[PDB]
Amino acid sequence: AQGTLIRVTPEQPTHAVCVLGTLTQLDICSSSFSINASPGVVVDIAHSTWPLDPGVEVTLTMKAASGSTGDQKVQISYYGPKTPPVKALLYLTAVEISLCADITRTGKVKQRTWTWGPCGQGAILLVNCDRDLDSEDLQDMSLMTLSTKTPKDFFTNHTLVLHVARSEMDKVRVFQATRKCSVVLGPKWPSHYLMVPGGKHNMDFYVEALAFPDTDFPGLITLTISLLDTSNLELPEAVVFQDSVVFRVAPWIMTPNTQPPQEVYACSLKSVTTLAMKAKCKLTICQDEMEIGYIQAPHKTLPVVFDSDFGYVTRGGLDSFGNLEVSPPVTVRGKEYPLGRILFGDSCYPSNDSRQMHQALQDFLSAQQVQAPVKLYSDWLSVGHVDEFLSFVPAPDRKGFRLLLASPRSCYKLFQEQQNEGHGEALLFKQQKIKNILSNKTLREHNSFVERCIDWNRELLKRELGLAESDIIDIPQLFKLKEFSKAEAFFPNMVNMLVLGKHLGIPKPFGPVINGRCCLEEKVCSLLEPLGLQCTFINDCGTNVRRKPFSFKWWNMVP
Amino acid sequence: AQGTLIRVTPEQPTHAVCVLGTLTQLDICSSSFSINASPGVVVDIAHSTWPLDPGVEVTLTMKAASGSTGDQKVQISYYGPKTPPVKALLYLTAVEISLCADITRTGKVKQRTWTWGPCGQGAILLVNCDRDLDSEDLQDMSLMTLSTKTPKDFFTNHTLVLHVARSEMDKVRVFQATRKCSVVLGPKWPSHYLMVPGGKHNMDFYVEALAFPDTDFPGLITLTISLLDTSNLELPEAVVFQDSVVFRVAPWIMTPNTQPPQEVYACSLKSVTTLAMKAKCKLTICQDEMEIGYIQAPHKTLPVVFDSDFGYVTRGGLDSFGNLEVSPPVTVRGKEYPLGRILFGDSCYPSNDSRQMHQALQDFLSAQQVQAPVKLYSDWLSVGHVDEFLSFVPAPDRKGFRLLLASPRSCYKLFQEQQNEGHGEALLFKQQKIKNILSNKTLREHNSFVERCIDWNRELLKRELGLAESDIIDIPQLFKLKEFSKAEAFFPNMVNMLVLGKHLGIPKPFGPVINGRCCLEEKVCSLLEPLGLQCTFINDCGTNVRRKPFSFKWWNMVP
């Protein structure tokens, strides 16, 4: 354990407290000898032994909490040459003081650093999310309990103070449970005196975080209990024993397309309701600027919405949440990413004309540390969203997903195959013929340049997510460089789909019709249906989706 | 290695660059086969083989830089059923592009993350320190070189851009070496086009940091070289190959009392010059608000002064640098602290009346990460400095230092021993007698309370620095609670000494004189002289000391 040094002097007896669980050592030389003590003081001693060397270690531990004070005694016998000399006397009071929380993330309150992992230790705190007391409101918060056993007469001479560092007080709030709840630690004040009675007592506190992690806040918060001696009245108080819990604020975590859908939201059409009904998920009608994630603690998980029983954050077009996706769980040269890995789009290098997501957003995602964001290249698109060039769908096999990427190649091939077979005369959507498209040398060279960009991202997503080609799947799709040599879809972007859990809501290309059936619509299906997916096409997109949070407990990650 | 995917099509030949050191893969299926190519393209291939499965991997690597473009060729032969069909053609240009720095901290420019340790990789940058171009000023800065070998005709169709993230541009500055130096990356602009000629070239840049680490800056800075295709003129530029170096800004590091003294400074007495002369260190006369540390890179170390060839920082009485010490190198339950471990004083818990060092200072020391500050308790002293209760001296044995702590006990004993031997009538410095001091029950209880405080710190310094009692040494010293029950020295604080490398400049107590020799002066010497120390006493302290920076290279630590 850790703790104190008691000095013993034949002049006058000493008095002292020993907190259970600590290591009380004893300074004899500062004044052969022998040691004798009450039955409940175990006096183990190394090199008992008799000598008077200061390298003699003497440690006392008490077996139990005292009933009075001086209940336990310790007699040290000074002797040698040819003399009786002194017996030095020492009067110990034993107390039990446990500041204790849920340090094993298991919903149950039972080494003073927070460590990640399945065999780590640390309580977890939820930030408080609310737009605009008893148990009616504390189910959400984190329970922490002081427990004490001390002799009835004890707190006339000692008091307990609970505190936080001035540097964390704004990021936390502690409530005290009288058996009303009132604030006792917080952004206003860092300490508080406890009115604890002698004998066997224990009091409950309730903690809430007020700040997600961020560049200026790793997300650790420490609350400490100090036991002070106030026995001498003129002297100030002396601290006898500090002990603490370290809490970690739960990060905001995003949910991938591979997670079962729980609910869809849309604004003021009736094709997404048909979709929801086959998907097994609920539909409520009352905007794609806000992303629905979650926070999670052993005792509570709670959906939290990231705008710009629902929580709410507002930190702050590449600089929007449509430029924000998450990979599904993936493993990458060993390192495991159980909660997926956040993808968001920017440029390659930075320039007079480069756009980017706002730095304060990027930073906030990084600090959330458990979905190590990856930067993709999307600045080549007029709009800028990574969703314009990728998507994720559930598979029932290899890894249990497929990365769909947009593929101008896969469209050229498809239209070329059509011509061969004899349908060069078919109308896409001006309304241009499937051939005039193939001949168009300015289109070609555009989709060539787009091809380079998507391919650049293919290779990042191959690297950063550990993907193999067997994980990817090219969906046929054309683009056009209009505004500023930036790209836009040459026909409805199919890869911008609503992945409603195995039931896909894809934008209908009004692609060239063969056997009374659109070739793109059709090729898309020979790619997806074998996987178990159920493609459906819609005409154009003001939809968010709440998905089931991962079983995996974020704190069991090891970033 | 890492890198690209080339698609081959029997319609028209393909052209491409391959940068030396990267992994170029080849998409055949997107259109049995056989592969044949120029002598300098090694075409290794797994499961050569003949099939037309897409799970066939084909990788090309070039042996050397091209002389022209299309110097190397690759022919892919499509065949099977009962047919000759197509040979698809591919024309490769090989270039060499190495952005490279001193990634092995060895003064010599020769995996794109900075890793700590004796077998880690990462260049190191010095922040620029200056109150108020060629080699005359670049010795201090960090050399980074682009080297290229490409065919003479190469940069008509490609250009190179050097860049930093917009989020690091303010923290760095890069200078370009024309063979004048001019800023090319910095707080103003994040990118720059390089005017590099085809053929064998290499250019030098010089980097400097402009920011020590701190809560908003882990201290990593990344510079990247991008190679862009500008061959099609209407299309925008496409990135072909990014590569980078990650630099780490060198922290500000403090020097303990155990480090050989190099120079003393004092303000406008002649006892510290006698001291300097026995110490072997220099003395210059022109204030204890500023602390002299150092920054260090393989190529340069440079003393830097921390006020509030000399660098200069000014981040911003517990809240001063007299409240700032460093432990000597120590090892603590395994974890090794080669550069010592910074001690600074504050309170126990925080209160209406607690003082503390300013949070922005604390944070800055922590971010400097390599001397993991420890918080001590000094708020119990009127003034507040940890130097009032401790010091460090060189020893020639166990660990090679001793922690001296103030000890009211050790003074009582010493005065008591004197009385016994018969000198209760001796005058300290009112002028009180050595006995009236012993009888004084208000003094006693004061030094009792001080004893608790120093003892609290004994145990922290035992814990956090891994000290044993055999490392500590009590120097006799009395205190008095005056102003606010806060403490001050009852007689000149001996433990507040000038450790000038084995030659100690201690404040003379005008302690009770025995055999014409002050007992304290004398006891102090029976504690220190056996260790090899040479105590000298002075009357009162406007002195700083520059000490030799540690041999150990901070970056070989592993925090």
The answer to whether A342 and A366 are in contact (CB under 8 A) is no
- E-strand ranges in B286-323 read 291-297, 300-306, 311-313
Tokens, residue A34: 């022998």
Same domain (yes/no): A46, A180 = no
Same domain (yes/no): B62, B106 = no
Per the entry, the structure determination technique was X-ray
Element at A284 (helix H, strand E): strand A282-285
Tokens, residue A298: 């052993």
Residues of B in contact with A227 (CB under 8 A): none
Q: What's B163's domain CATH number?
A: 2.60.40.1700
Same domain (yes/no): A87, A106 = no
Same domain (yes/no): A33, A21 = yes
Between CA B444 and CA B480 the distance in angstroms is 9
Q: Give the burial string for A246-261 (b: 16+ CB within 10 Å, else e).
A: bbbbbbbbbbbbbbeb
Question: Mind telling me how many Å the CA of B549 is from chain A's nearest CA?
Answer: 31
CB atoms within 10 A of CB B507: 18
Q: What's A61's domain CATH number?
A: 2.60.40.1860
CA angle A36, A42, A46 (to 5 degrees): 85
Tell me whether residues A226 and B349 touch, CB distance under 8 A: yes
Question: Mind telling me how many Å the CA of A219 is from chain B's nearest CA?
Answer: 13
Tell me whether residues B356 and A166 touch, CB distance under 8 A: yes
Question: Mind telling me how many Å the CA of A299 is from chain B's nearest CA?
Answer: 30
> Alpha-carbon dihedral of residues B379, B380, B382, B388, nearest 10 degrees?
-90
> In total, how many domains does chain A have?
3
Handedness of CA B364, B367, B370, B372 (dihedral sign): positive
Q: What's A480's domain CATH number?
A: 3.75.10.10
Minimum-distance CB partner of A350 among B191, B239, B453: B191
Strands B472-476 and B401-407: parallel
Same domain (yes/no): B231, B362 = no
The answer to whether A418 and A434 are in contact (CB under 8 A) is yes
Between CA A188 and CA A168 the distance in angstroms is 11
Between CA B518 and CA B371 the distance in angstroms is 39
Between CA B508 and CA A409 the distance in angstroms is 88
Between CA B32 and CA A479 the distance in angstroms is 33
Tell me whether residues A191 and B481 touch, CB distance under 8 A: no
Fill in the DSSP letter of residue A471.
G
Indicate the SS3 state at residue B273.
helix
Residues of B in contact with A164 (CB under 8 A): 350
Strands A172-177 and A181-185: antiparallel
Q: Give the burial string for B15-41 (b: 16+ CB within 10 Å, else e).
A: ebbbbbebebebbbeebebebebbebb
- Hey, of B31, B171, B348, which one would you mutate to test binding to chain A, going by the most A CBs within 10 A of its CB? B348
> Alpha-carbon dihedral of residues B463, B466, B469, B475, nearest 10 degrees?
-80
Final residue in a domain of this structure, among A100, A133, A161: A100
Question: Mind telling me how many Å the CA of B165 is from chain A's nearest CA?
Answer: 7
- Only one residue has tokens 């000692």, namely A158
Strands A158-164 and A191-194: antiparallel
Between CA B75 and CA B88 the distance in angstroms is 6
Same domain (yes/no): A476, A429 = yes
Strands A181-185 and A191-194: unpaired
Tell me whether residues A481 and B359 touch, CB distance under 8 A: no
Same domain (yes/no): A112, A94 = no
Q: DSSP characters for A236-276?
A: PPEEEEEEEEEEEEPPPB---TTSPEEEEEE----SHHHHH
Catalytic residue among B163, B385, B423, B446: B385
The answer to whether A205 and A146 are in contact (CB under 8 A) is yes
Same domain (yes/no): B355, B486 = yes
- Whole-angstrom CA distances from B313 to B131, B287, B288, B292 are 9, 16, 15, 10
- Only one residue has tokens 């020979």, namely A526
Between CA B543 and CA B539 the distance in angstroms is 14
Same domain (yes/no): A280, A243 = no
Tell me whether residues B409 and A7 touch, CB distance under 8 A: yes
Strands B41-45 and B33-37: unpaired
Tokens, residue B332: 């603590």
Indicate the SS3 state at residue B346.
strand
The answer to whether B129 and B311 are in contact (CB under 8 A) is yes
Residue B120 amino acid letter: G
Q: Give the burial string for A168-191 (b: 16+ CB within 10 Å, else e).
A: bbebbbbbbbeeebeebbbeebbb
- Only one residue has tokens 């010795």, namely B139
Residues of B in contact with A485 (CB under 8 A): 234-236
Tokens, residue B343: 């001690």
Tokens, residue B6: 């080339």
Fill in the DSSP letter of residue B415.
H
Could you tell me the residue range of the domain that residue B167 belongs to? 101-249
Strands A142-150 and A72-78: unpaired
Strands A123-125 and A191-194: unpaired
Minimum-distance CB partner of A458 among B5, B167, B239: B5
Q: Closest Cα partner for A388 from A446, A437, A453?
A: A453
Tell me whether residues B5 and A455 touch, CB distance under 8 A: yes
Percent helix, strand, coil in chain A (nearest 5)? 15, 40, 45
Element at B450 (helix H, strand E): helix B441-464
Handedness of CA A521, A522, A527, A530 (dihedral sign): positive
Between CA A534 and CA A256 the distance in angstroms is 18
Indicate the SS3 state at residue A204.
strand
Between CA B546 and CA B311 the distance in angstroms is 13
Final residue in a domain of this structure, among A207, A228, A249: A249
- E-strand ranges in A314-453 read 324-326, 330-332, 335-337, 342-346, 374-377, 390-394, 401-407
Catalytic residue among B153, B288, B319, B363: B288
Minimum-distance CB partner of A349 among B54, B163, B469: B163
Element at B416 (helix H, strand E): helix B408-420
The answer to whether A328 and A401 are in contact (CB under 8 A) is yes
Between CA B391 and CA B325 the distance in angstroms is 9
Between CA A358 and CA A335 the distance in angstroms is 28
Q: DSSP characters for B207-268?
A: EEE----BTTB-SEEEEEEEEEE--SSSSPPEEEEEEEEEEEEPPPB---TTSPEEEEEE--
Tell me whether residues A481 and B235 touch, CB distance under 8 A: yes
Final residue in a domain of this structure, among A65, A100, A135: A100
Element at B513 (helix H, strand E): strand B513-514
Element at A527 (helix H, strand E): helix A519-528
The answer to whether B441 and B372 are in contact (CB under 8 A) is no
Query: What residues form DSSP beta bridges with A375?
Result: A344
Same domain (yes/no): B131, B42 = no
Question: Mind telling me how many Å the CA of B291 is from chain A's nearest CA?
Answer: 24
Minimum-distance CB partner of A191 among B235, B351, B458: B351
Catalytic residue among B29, B267, B348, B541: B541
Same domain (yes/no): A354, A477 = yes
- Only one residue has tokens 């001796």, namely B426
Q: Closest Cα partner for A545 from A269, A298, A278, A294?
A: A294
Same domain (yes/no): B45, B105 = no
Residues of A in contact with B473 (CB under 8 A): none
Between CA A515 and CA A274 the distance in angstroms is 26
Cα atoms in the Cβ-side hemisphere of radius 13 Å centred on B345:
29
Fill in the DSSP letter of residue A156.
G
Between CA B190 and CA B232 the distance in angstroms is 25
